[PDB]
Design an enzyme around this catalytic site. Structure first.
Site, PDB file in Angstrom:
ATOM      1  N   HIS A  45       0.842  -1.196   0.000  1.00 48.74           N
ATOM      2  CA  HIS A  45       0.000   0.000   0.000  1.00 48.74           C
ATOM      3  C   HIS A  45       0.895   1.272   0.000  1.00 48.74           C
ATOM      4  O   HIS A  45       0.466   2.283  -0.465  1.00 48.74           O
ATOM      5  CB  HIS A  45      -1.066   0.004   1.124  1.00 48.74           C
ATOM      6  CG  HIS A  45      -0.575   0.385   2.482  1.00 48.74           C
ATOM      7  ND1 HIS A  45      -0.316  -0.559   3.480  1.00 48.74           N
ATOM      8  CD2 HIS A  45      -0.314   1.610   3.036  1.00 48.74           C
ATOM      9  CE1 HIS A  45       0.091   0.074   4.576  1.00 48.74           C
ATOM     10  NE2 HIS A  45       0.093   1.385   4.339  1.00 48.74           N
ATOM     11  N   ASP A  93      -0.395  -7.527   1.401  1.00 52.71           N
ATOM     12  CA  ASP A  93       0.135  -6.180   1.536  1.00 52.71           C
ATOM     13  C   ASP A  93       1.624  -6.236   1.684  1.00 52.71           C
ATOM     14  O   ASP A  93       2.224  -6.117   2.797  1.00 52.71           O
ATOM     15  CB  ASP A  93      -0.540  -5.424   2.677  1.00 52.71           C
ATOM     16  CG  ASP A  93      -0.248  -3.952   2.643  1.00 52.71           C
ATOM     17  OD1 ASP A  93       0.368  -3.503   1.613  1.00 52.71           O
ATOM     18  OD2 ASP A  93      -0.627  -3.258   3.635  1.00 52.71           O
ATOM     19  N   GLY A 186       2.601   5.983   8.870  1.00 46.23           N
ATOM     20  CA  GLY A 186       4.019   6.232   8.593  1.00 46.23           C
ATOM     21  C   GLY A 186       4.913   5.139   9.115  1.00 46.23           C
ATOM     22  O   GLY A 186       6.112   5.119   8.772  1.00 46.23           O
ATOM     23  N   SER A 188       3.772   2.011   8.465  1.00 45.86           N
ATOM     24  CA  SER A 188       3.475   1.053   7.387  1.00 45.86           C
ATOM     25  C   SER A 188       4.702   0.626   6.610  1.00 45.86           C
ATOM     26  O   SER A 188       5.578   1.469   6.308  1.00 45.86           O
ATOM     27  CB  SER A 188       2.520   1.678   6.386  1.00 45.86           C
ATOM     28  OG  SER A 188       1.245   1.891   6.988  1.00 45.86           O
ATOM     29  N   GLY A 189       4.767  -0.669   6.294  1.00 49.75           N
ATOM     30  CA  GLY A 189       5.887  -1.208   5.510  1.00 49.75           C
ATOM     31  C   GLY A 189       7.095  -1.651   6.321  1.00 49.75           C
ATOM     32  O   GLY A 189       7.900  -2.419   5.811  1.00 49.75           O
TER      33      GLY A 189
END
Ligand SMILES: [Ca+2]
Length: 240
Positions: A45, A93, A186, A188-189
Site C-alpha cells: 500500500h 500487503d 508512517g 506502514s511497511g
C-alpha cells in the site's frame, strides 16, 4: 509509533525509511526492511501512489544529519500480484523494491533476518515494532526512530468478534492491542521484530490499524505475515 521509546542507533539496522520527492525535498512516508544489499521489503500500500521513491538506510533522526545515512533510488517495484488497494483486509500487503545501487553494510545497515516459511508465533510472543510513524493518533511523525513492545495476539483471538473479526487473515500477524502502544501512520511497511531462539527476526510488515485510531484497545496493529511470503520473496529476487 504510539507509546514507543527512542531506539538505540544500532538496535534495528535493517530498518529503512521509504521517502518520496516533494518539491525540492523528500518526505518520509513508510518503513521498510533491508533484506538484500539491493532489495527492500515493504507494504504494497506504501507504493500505490505514482511517486518518486528513495530509500534511506542507516537513518536514525529524520530531521538531523546522523553521519551514517546512505541514500538510494528505487529502480524497480514488484508488488504482490494479488494485492488489491481497495481491499487491505484481503492481505497480500507486501512489495519488494530493487535499489538502484547496493548499499554498504555496517553496524547501522544490516540485512533483516526472516523467519522460515510457515512459522507462526505462539500467542503473546515478544516483539517490537519500529518506525518513524505518528506518535499519537492524528499526530506527527517521530524525528528519532521509535520502538514499542507489542506482544503478538494469535489468529484465534485476533479474528474473534471483539478484536478484528473476519478482517484478519491467517496471512497476517497481529501485535499489541493494549490501548497505549501501537503502530500508526508512517510505520506502514516497516518491521515487526520478534525474538525467537535468541535472535530477532522480522515476522511482520506493518499493514494497518483501526480507522478509529492507532492505539485502540483490542485493535492490535496488523502486519503482513512475512513467513507466508518466503517463497514469493525468493522467486522475485531470483527472477530480478
Ligand atoms: Ca538523519
Amino acid at each position: 509509533v504510539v507509546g514507543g521509546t527512542e531506539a538505540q542507533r544500532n538496535s534495528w539496522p535493517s530498518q529503512i525509511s521509504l521517502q518520496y520527492r516533494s518539491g525540492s525535498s523528500w518526505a518520509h512516508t513508510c518503513g521498510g526492511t533491508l533484506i538484500r544489499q539491493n532489495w527492500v521489503m515493504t507494504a504494497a500500500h506504501c507504493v500505490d501512489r505514482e511517486l518518486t521513491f528513495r530509500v534511506v538506510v542507516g537513518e536514525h533522526n529524520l530531521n538531523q544529519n546522523d553521519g551514517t545515512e546512505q541514500y538510494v533510488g528505487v529502480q524497480k517495484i514488484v508488488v504482490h500480484p494479488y494485492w488489491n488497494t481497495d481491499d487491505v483486509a484481503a492481505g497480500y500487503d507486501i512489495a519488494l523494491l530493487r535499489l538502484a545501487q547496493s548499499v554498504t553494510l555496517n553496524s547501522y545497515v544490516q540485512l533483516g533476518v526472516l523467519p522460515r516459511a510457515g512459522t507462526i508465533l505462539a500467542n503473546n510472543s515478544p516483539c517490537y515494532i519500529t518506525g518513524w510513524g505518528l506518535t499519537r493518533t492524528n499526530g506527527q511523525l517521530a524525528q528519532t526512530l521509535q520502538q514499542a513492545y507489542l506482544p503478538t495476539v494469535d489468529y484465534a483471538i485476533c479474528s474473534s468478534s471483539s478484536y478484528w473479526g473476519s478482517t484478519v487473515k491467517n496471512s497476517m500477524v497481529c501485535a499489541g492491542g493494549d490501548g497505549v502502544r501501537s503502530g500508526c501512520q508512517g510505520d506502514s511497511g516497516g518491521p515487526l521484530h520478534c525474538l525467537v531462539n535468541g535472535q530477532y527476526a522480522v515476522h511482520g510488515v506493518t499493514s494497518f490499524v483501526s480507522r478509529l485510531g492507532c492505539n485502540v484497545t483490542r485493535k492490535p496493529t496488523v502486519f503482513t505475515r512475512v513467513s507466508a511470503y518466503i517463497s514469493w520473496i525468493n522467486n522475485v529476487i531470483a527472477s530480478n
